[PDB]
Amino acid sequence: QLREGNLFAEQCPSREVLKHVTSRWGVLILVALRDGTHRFSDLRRKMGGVSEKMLAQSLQALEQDGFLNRVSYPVVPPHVEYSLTPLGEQVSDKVAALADWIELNLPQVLAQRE
Amino acid sequence: EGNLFAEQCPSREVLKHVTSRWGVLILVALRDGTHRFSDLRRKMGGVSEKMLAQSLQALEQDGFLNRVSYPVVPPHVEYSLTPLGEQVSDKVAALADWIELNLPQVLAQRER
Numbered sequence: 128q129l130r131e132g133n134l135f136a137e138q139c140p141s142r143e144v145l146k147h148v149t150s151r152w153g154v155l156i157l158v159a160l161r162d163g164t165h166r167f168s169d170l171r172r173k174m175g176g177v178s179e180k181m182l183a184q185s186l187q188a189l190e191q192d193g194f195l196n197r198v199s200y201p202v203v204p205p206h207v208e209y210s211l212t213p214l215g216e217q218v219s220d221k222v223a224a225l226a227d228w229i230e231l232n233l234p235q236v237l238a239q240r241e
Numbered sequence: 242e243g244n245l246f247a248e249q250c251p252s253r254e255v256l257k258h259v260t261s262r263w264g265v266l267i268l269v270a271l272r273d274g275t276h277r278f279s280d281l282r283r284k285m286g287g288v289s290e291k292m293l294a295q296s297l298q299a300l301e302q303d304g305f306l307n308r309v310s311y312p313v314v315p316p317h318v319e320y321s322l323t324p325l326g327e328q329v330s331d332k333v334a335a336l337a338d339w340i341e342l343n344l345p346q347v348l349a350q351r352e353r
């Protein structure tokens with residue numbers, strides 16, 4: 128279906144894309160790669176609290192969405208490296224503006240919760 | 242200031258709230274103006290009363306929403322964006338719109 132999405136529609140696939148890019152690991156992946164290529168072990172390092180499995184699972188959902196390049200190096204020690212595609216750069220700009228806004232306006236939000 | 246990379250940062254909770262499926266829809270719908278609970282509910286395909294009530298409570302406790310109760314019979318409740326909710330909403334709506342706009346390219350990468 129080559130339509131534009133409608134998030135208000137029950138079962139539009141944009142809801143899935145939205146979930147992938149704003150899940151707690153998807154956001155961190157997308158913000159981190161703005162700095163450049165990272166190996167699996169570099170992401171896993173910055174993101175305290177993520178298991179291997181859940182990281183593999185976000186990285187995979189983001190790659191099949193078209194946001195990441197994944198390059199294998201079977202050479203010893205083996206690594207897999209990740210970077211953003213041009214499409215992935217766009218969404219990442221949107222995710223980062225939001226993440227930044229939140230980090231910056233947190234004290235007013237916390238001062239609200241009482 | 243927040244740090245989303247740190248496992249215990251409250252920025253993660255607020256992020257969860259503005260970025261949930263229902264939270265995104267509430268923040269985008271209210272950009273049109275004040276809505277009743279029932280008008281939100283009819284726009285958001287698949288939402289339960291419980292889930293709609295839960296996201297609205299979280300967005301109001303964060304400072305993003307005004308709630309006005311009309312206890313007259315039949316009772317109703319109205320929501321609008323605070324100035325602060327207008328600001329997160331802009332960033333949320335820009336993200337919602339990019340995703341919907343670029344959905345065709347995403348689906349094309351899925352089939353490959």
Ligand SMILES: [Cl-]
Nearest residue numbers: 167168206207
């Ligand atoms: Cl690796």
Ligand SMILES: [Cl-]
Nearest residue numbers: 278279317318
């Ligand atoms: Cl109502």
